[PDB]
Amino acid sequence: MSLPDGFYIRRMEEGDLEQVTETLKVLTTVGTITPESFCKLIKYWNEATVWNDKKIMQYNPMVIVDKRTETVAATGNIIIERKIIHELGLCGHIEDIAVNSKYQGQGLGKLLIDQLVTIGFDYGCYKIILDCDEKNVKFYEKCGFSNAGVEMQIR
Template identity: 55%
Template sequence: MTAGYTIRRISKDDYEGVIDTLKVLTVVGDVSRRRFEEIVDHWDAVYLHGTSTRQYNPLVVVEDATGQIAATGNIILERKLIHDAGLCGHIEDIAVSKSHQGKRLGKFLIDRLTQLGFEAGCYKIILDCDPKNVPFYEKCGYSKAGIEMQIRR
């Protein structure tokens, strides 16, 4: 871990920092503090059936000196029927705030989320990203697989 930073699970007190950090990724929109807290409660409450493993694993990287949130990301664990009812991990919503980029925090965050997924028993971990981020994910040990498709409304 880069010196001067700590990684931990998101808490309900992280509202401003997380919303702000996510703005480097996409439009966050109108998410009230109350809605944020409800979502964090939901993430905390959902466990994989019959286990003590949480389905949602949202993390934040915090700058020790300021308490500022520098990065955030999540791994969601999906129970499948295939692969002997295996687990697939989905890495989502990775963002390192502008002033903290280039300090290896993104790589540390991905490494931690990946470790969390494999320790939970995932047979694979997948993510979608912009082509410009491919070299970053390759440095984190990921490789290209398939093509992302989507439908939106």
């Protein structure tokens, strides 16, 4: 799908390895990943389906691309889960948001989230959640999100 000022958004592809690992670095440690592992990863992500006239993908890994040079400007994913509560409802989980360093401050982060949400709600999610740091509560509030709890973790 097309977006303004010459960027567009589409699902991630096997050939995105270099650029995606590069923009994900902004988020954390990505490590060594071989083209083969990646293709298997991408084929899993392209075949994993959520039992539901809709085809529902569990993983929806997006990259926003600068059409100018076909360079990945940002990536984000939304994972779909089917629960029992809410009449066997769907809950979306936005994960791994990263705006590439040379593309910061151009509004792409908010466009990416908007798209992930759109994707989640079209599938029928009764809600979409994500976790963030306090310093980013404001930003997600601008994307229409609300404070809803606390994130707990165990490594």
